[PDB]
Design a protein around this ligand. Structure first.
Ligand SMILES: CCCCCCCC/C=C\CCCCCCCC(=O)OC[C@H](COP(=O)(O)OCCN)OC(=O)CCCCCCC/C=C\CCCCCCCC
Ligand code: HEC
Ligand code: HEM
Ligand code: HEM
Ligand SMILES: COC(=O)N(OC)c1ccccc1COc1ccn(-c2ccc(Cl)cc2)n1
Lengths: 378, 64, 51, 106, 71, 241, 48
């Protein structure tokens, strides 16, 4: 006779958001999952506007984007909401993955594996959105993918020709990149409902790594007011980057139009791909470089199998905490190297840092957990 | 007219004179022999970088 | 590791490796018309499948 | 199993016990174990007084972490007072799992 | 997973106060400032030494780039 | 092999976080584009409807595009009937033989300017520091005939001959027309052209910061009120002995 | 679009190299004439 416990649609909402049992010691690092759901909704109600006034061809792409900032009303605010809103999505995604790596949340096996699929889908989407404005960074960044995509020994030469519209740089190139960019954000929205349905079977992990069934609180009102406050602080940072420095995250050379006119002074993507561009560039073989690109993201699936500690999280593991922050400092090095020219000090550094990224995850982390097991007399 | 007089006192800074003097010490090194392509674009970059720093600090008061 | 050790683990995998070309060759015939694999349509002289 | 490093390697064990900080939350070592299927069978086999002690110690530590606080230093768990109450029950559960696995392949 | 079906617990008492009976801001700089200094000291030797080695490699890498184009 | 030179930082009057543009220095700077160049550079994205309100009222913008005569479209029994420009125009373009007009400039075509400060790694500090920074070629540097030594250029020898001396121009209000009053006004131009939303996003950024100074400490007060129940609770364990 | 329906591709270009329509401009000149370039719509009679 309580209507929120018996109505067929209301009882789904009540079990998911209102009466859900939640741990009481959940930190601010657990805020970034609902922030990713705000950034995905915002990139949908802003990509509505841009695809309305758009034409994607080799003759008019660079001018179709400059028409919006000047002529189309409220187009300067919505364009730079979309270009900085995708940088906001990628910083909320790297915090989210590093949380679950630190606290051992990958032991939720089905939830972790759908997450690795979600990391691939947003990375491939944003690559096919930076090729749409058609500047120097759009051209020379796309034409280093296909050099390693035609290196596939059997099917690769007819694979790139099927996605380039039919020949090469032409009118219909940006009809298959644009098709693979309008529709991929909606597979992400369906993969996120399945992602939460698997988490609902166990509930959440907590910073201690110990099960918390004796200390649960309801989700409303404790974490509904805490997720609203954290989302308000995200809108403040995003509107500061839009209304006070809308070109801070960007490259001026992508305002120079696209043409095979002249070789550019440099080639570099956005900041959230600089760690991946630095790894493939330090391999002098277009097949070994495309294998280590996919092996830098799909290595996350081996994290349940490589676990050798008797504890779940890293809160009580001081030797493992040192290795986690060495891995974060290794990804900062690859982001810096990936925006540097290919010269003398940035090849020996960029290829030793590519080695240490795989040595920490595969070798150094499983041995150190075993050493800590022996020191605690188990 | 204000630039050509603001640029005059910016050269007698001690950071700008020793960027000027071994620019002209290498002048009689290039036109001396025939076996050289020792150019003087390195010696002149350090002059202009030391000089145009102090010009930007003072030029905009004398304008508009 | 004695994780998956045993004479039982490769005994059911002994009688399935005849029908485990239903794992690999079925993927090899599962990409004949989904892909239009160009140079292995002349695997047979029989497929003049596109004009 | 070295007799020359009998005291030296116990100094590294006592150092690691204090660098890890479950004793600052008033926890014992077996409170912090990850609960897989063999651990969950050993908890079900505990006597009723050792079960109730473990449930309260975990609840008090979760409440301290919510407030970002620790206990006074005179209430920390000492190194030579930590009781491994779960280790005899867990060695028996694992021995029974390994017996059912040699039988399934022989 | 509903609230009355989670776990078994005995002999535990909790006491609470209404939100309208207490101050929303208790000791803030009296307790809070020495608390955030204990938390900073406890984690500084684990987090900081990796980021120092990034700083030394960055300075050596930009200085040996310019002492190659010079002559 | 050689190094490169980067432009220094000039204290522009719009460099601050809440600083507007000077609406007199864009008026004087349109005419350093209007009648010192447009013999080499187009600006294919700005119109005379974009100049009203910023620096003109509509009558002074209507009087221009009648200094230019461009080729309009067709009619019946006339073919390419023409006119002076309307105010909804990209007013002329420069040189014909497009993208190969470098025969007039010895193998180097000058580019468009309607996004040139957004497309460089110096903003409008680069355009200023190259326009007023010509030098003589130093010792040993041999020059192809048609190259002029500019140290703020990546190739170190631009095909640009210097376009300004002193008084190539005289303004409408009465202002000395020295080489630094020139190229300061056209670099307050070419930045408004790249970013015509400059003064609008700084006034909207001020209203945002005053609403978030109200909305944020109040939502934090509602969070602090609910969570005080858990923050003040006490626990006790009383087992039977 | 006439090739393969009622003409082969020669017998088809010769009907396009029979009418004279105005092409675009070229530098060192102006609007010139260049007839049928194998892909051309059928010529209208009236200018307006
Ligand atoms: C550019 C400058 C970059 C600066 C990076 C420094 C970030 C500092 C973050 C806060 C540091 C901090 O507070 O550490 C202490 C604090 C201690 O917490 P306890 O749970 O109590 O552990 C017990 C300790 N006895 O550590 C933590 O909060 C754990 C961090 C968990 C969240 C991690 C979020 C992600 C951070 C790294 C991102 C990069 C890795 C991402 C990998 C993705 C690969 C595709
Ligand atoms: C003497 C003819 C001429 C005049 C007049 C002229 N320029 Fe240029 N400019 C050139 C040439 C030639 C280039 C092509 C550069 C090249 O490819 O070497 C160029 C290119 C440029 C560039 C690009 C340089 C770079 O580093 O990318 C800028 C900026 C520029 N012009 C600004 C101006 C401005 C502002 C004016 C008006 C004061 C002006 N120019 C007047 C000759 C001229
Ligand atoms: C579009 C992308 C994503 C969305 C919308 C999303 C959403 C969420 C939400 C709402 C939660 C619950 C609240 C929280 O703990 O933050 C969550 C938890 C979780 N997510 Fe994601 N996520 C995304 C991507 C990922 C990725 C890339 C990974 C890992 C590779 C991942 C793994 C996890 C895990 C393991 C948890 C449970 C963590 C715990 O309870 O300790 N998710 N996610
Ligand atoms: C996960 C969600 C999304 C991400 C990460 C993303 C990313 C991007 C990126 C990086 C750009 C390039 C902007 C620039 O370089 O200036 C862009 C713009 C664009 N996006 Fe998206 N986007 C998302 C959602 C969408 C949606 C939902 C649509 C269509 C309905 C869309 C269609 C477009 C189009 C047409 C552009 C045109 C270029 C421009 O206007 O700048 N995107 N997006
Ligand atoms: C915003 O777009 C860019 O940064 N793009 O692409 C237009 C760009 C521009 C210039 C140079 C290089 C790139 C791309 O560099 C990389 C490096 C790795 N990926 C990648 C892409 C997809 C997936 Cl699934 C995994 C990895 N992309």
């Amino acid at each position: 006779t309580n209507i929120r416990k018996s109505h067929p649609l209301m009882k789904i909402i009540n079990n998911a958001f209102i009466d859900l049992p939640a741990p009481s010691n959940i930190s601010s690092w657990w805020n970034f999952g609902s922030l990713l759901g705000i950034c995905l909704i915002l990139q949908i109600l802003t990509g509505l506007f841009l695809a309305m006034h758009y034409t994607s061809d080799t003759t008019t792409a660079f001018s179709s984007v400059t028409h919006i900032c000047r002529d189309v009303n409220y187009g300067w605010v919505i364009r730079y909401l979309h270009a900085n809103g995708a940088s906001m999505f990628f910083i909320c995604l790297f915090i989210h993955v590093g949380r679950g790596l630190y606290y051992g949340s990958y032991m939720f096996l089905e939830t972790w594996n759908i997450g690795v699929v979600l990391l691939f889908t947003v990375m491939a989407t944003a690559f096919m959105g930076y090729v749409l404005p058609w500047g120097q960074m759009s051209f020379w960044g796309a034409t280093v993918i296909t050099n390693l995509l035609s290196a596939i020994p059997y099917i690769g030469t007819d694979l790139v020709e099927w996605i380039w519209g039919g020949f090469s740089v032409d009118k219909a190139t940006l009809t298959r990149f644009f098709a693979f960019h309008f529709i991929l954000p909606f597979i992400i929205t369906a993969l996120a409902a399945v992602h939460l349905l698997f988490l609902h079977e166990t509930g959440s992990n907590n910073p201690t790594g110990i099960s918390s069934d004796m200390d649960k609180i309801p989700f409303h009102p404790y974490y509904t007011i805490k997720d609203i406050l954290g989302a308000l602080f995200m809108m403040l940072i995003l509107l500061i980057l839009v209304l006070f420095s809308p070109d801070l995250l960007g490259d001026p050379d992508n305002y120079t139009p696209a043409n095979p006119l002249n070789t550019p002074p440099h080639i570099k993507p956005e900041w959230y791909f600089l760690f991946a561009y630095a790894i493939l560039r330090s391999i002098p073989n277009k097949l070994g470089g495309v294998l280590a690109l996919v092996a830098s993201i799909l290595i996350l699936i081996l994290m349940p199998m490589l676990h050798t500690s008797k504890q779940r999280s890293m809160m009580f593991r001081p030797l493992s905490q040192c290795l986690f922050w060495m891995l974060v400092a290794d990804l900062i090095t690859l982001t810096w190297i990936g925006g540097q020219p290919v010269e003398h000090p940035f090849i020996i550094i960029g290829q030793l840092a590519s080695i240490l990224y795989f040595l920490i995850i595969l070798v150094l982390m499983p041995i150190t957990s075993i050493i800590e097991n022996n020191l605690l007399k188990w | 007219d204000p630039l050509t007089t603001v640029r005059e006192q910016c050269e007698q800074i001690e950071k700008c004179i020793k960027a000027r003097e071994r620019l002209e010490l290498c002048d009689q090194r290039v036109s001396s022999r025939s076996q050289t392509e020792e150019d003087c674009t390195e010696e002149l970059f350090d002059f202009l970088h030391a000089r145009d720093h102090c010009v930007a600090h003072k030029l905009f008061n004398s304008l508009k | 590791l004695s994780r998956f050790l045993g004479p039982r683990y490769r005994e059911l995998a002994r009688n399935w490796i005849p029908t485990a070309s239903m794992w690999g060759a079925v993927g090899a015939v599962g990409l004949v018309w989904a892909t239009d694999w160009r140079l292995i349509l002349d695997w047979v002289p029989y497929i003049n499948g596109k004009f | 199993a070295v007799a020359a490093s009998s005291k030296w390697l116990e100094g590294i064990r006592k150092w690691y016990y204090n660098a890890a900080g479950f004793n600052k939350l008033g926890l014992m070592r077996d409170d912090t174990i990850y609960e897989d299927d063999d651990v969950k069978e050993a908890i079900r086999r505990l006597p009723e007084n050792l079960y109730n002690d473990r449930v309260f110690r975990i609840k008090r530590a979760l409440d301290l972490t919510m407030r970002q606080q620790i206990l006074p230093k005179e209430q920390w768990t000492k190194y030579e007072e930590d009781k491994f109450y779960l280790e005899p029950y867990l060695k028996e559960v694992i021995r029974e799992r390994k017996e059912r696995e040699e039988w399934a392949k022989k | 997973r509903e609230f009355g079906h989670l776990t078994r617990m005995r002999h535990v008492i909790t006491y609470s106060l209404s939100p309208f009976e207490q101050r929303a801001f208790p000791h803030y700089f009296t307790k809070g400032i020495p608390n955030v200094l204990r938390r900073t000291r406890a984690c500084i030797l684990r987090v900081a030494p990796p980021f120092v080695v990034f700083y030394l490699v960055y300075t050596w890498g930009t200085q040996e780039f310019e002492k190659s184009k010079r002559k | 092999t050689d190094l490169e030179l980067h432009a220094p930082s000039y204290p522009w009057s719009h460099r601050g976080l809440l600083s507007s543009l000077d609406h007199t220095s864009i008026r004087r700077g349109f005419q350093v584009y209007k009648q010192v160049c447009s013999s080499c550079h187009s600006m294919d994205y700005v119109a005379y409807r974009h100049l009203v309100g910023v620096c003109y009222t509509e009558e002074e913008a209507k009087a221009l595009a009648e200094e230019v005569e461009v080729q309009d479209g067709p009619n019946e029994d006339g073919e390419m009937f023409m006119r002076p420009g309307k105010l909804s125009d990209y007013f002329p373009k420069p040189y014909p033989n497009p993208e190969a007009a470098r025969a007039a400039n010895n193998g180097a075509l000058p580019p468009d300017l309607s996004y040139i400060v957004r497309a460089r790694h110096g903003g409008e500090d680069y355009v200023f520091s190259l326009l007023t920074g010509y030098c003589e070629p130093p010792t040993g540097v041999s020059l192809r005939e048609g190259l002029y030594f500019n140290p703020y250029f990546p190739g170190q020898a631009i095909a640009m001959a210097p376009p300004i001396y002193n008084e190539v121009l005289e303004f409408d209000d009465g202002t000395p027309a020295t080489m630094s009053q020139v190229a300061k006004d056209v670099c307050t131009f070419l930045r408004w052209a790249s970013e015509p939303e400059h003064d609008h996003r700084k006034r909207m950024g001020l209203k945002m910061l005053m609403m978030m100074g109200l909305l944020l400490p109040l939502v934090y007060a509602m969070k602090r009120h609910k969570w005080s129940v858990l923050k003040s609770r006490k626990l006790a364990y009383r087992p039977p002995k």
